[PDB]
């Protein structure tokens, strides 16, 4: 599974619609498993993961030490496994977090990228990974 996390990031990186991405464990150590280098999501720490998976009412989470704003949250639902946010700083950009059996996939679009494209791209990656048991 470790190599595959990097393959997912590589695939995202080739697409000019996205600005940032990371895959972070949520089961055990909560370390960053793969990330686009030298951007915000590479800095996600365990204390940022726990509120996302625990607090039903999370609204202004810190992600890589910057605030984001939650506008839909079905992250812990087994059928949807996705949350939608906006950055809480300029330029306002769309974010989707999708949940596999063991990891969170964070994806940020450029400001011009549609909500649909970020959602479908992030969630489809999670759908594929879930089929492997990860």
Residue numbers in the entry: 0 to 133
Relevant lines from the article:
There are no structures of proteins encoded by the MPXV genome other than computational models. The A42R protein that is encoded by the gp153 locus of MPXV has significant amino-acid sequence identity to eukaryotic cell profilin proteins. Proteins from the profilin family are actin-binding proteins that participate in the assembly and regulation of F-actin. The VACV profilin-homology protein (VACV A42R), which is 98% identical to MPXV A42R, is a late-expressing viral protein with a weak affinity for actin. Thus, the role of these highly conserved profilin-like proteins in the poxvirus infection cycle is unknown.
Here, a 1.52 Å resolution X-ray structure of the MPXV protein A42R, the first MPXV-encoded protein with a known structure, is reported. Here, we report the structure of the profilin-like protein A42R, the first structure of an MPXV protein to be deposited in the Protein Data Bank (PDB). Although the structure detailed here was first deposited and released in 2014, it remains the only protein from MPXV in the PDB and the only poxvirus profilin-like protein with a known structure. A42R shows structural similarity to profilins, which are cellular proteins that are known to function in the regulation of actin cytoskeletal assembly. However, structural comparison of A42R with known members of the profilin family reveals critical differences that support prior biochemical findings that A42R only weakly binds actin and does not bind poly(l-proline). In addition, the analysis suggests that A42R may make distinct interactions with phosphatidylinositol lipids. Comparison with structures of human and bovine profilin proteins reveals significant differences in functional regions, indicating that the role of MPXV A42R in the viral life cycle may not be easily determined based solely on our understanding of cellular profilin function. Overall, the data suggest that the role of A42R in the replication of orthopoxviruses may not be readily determined by comparison to cellular profilins.
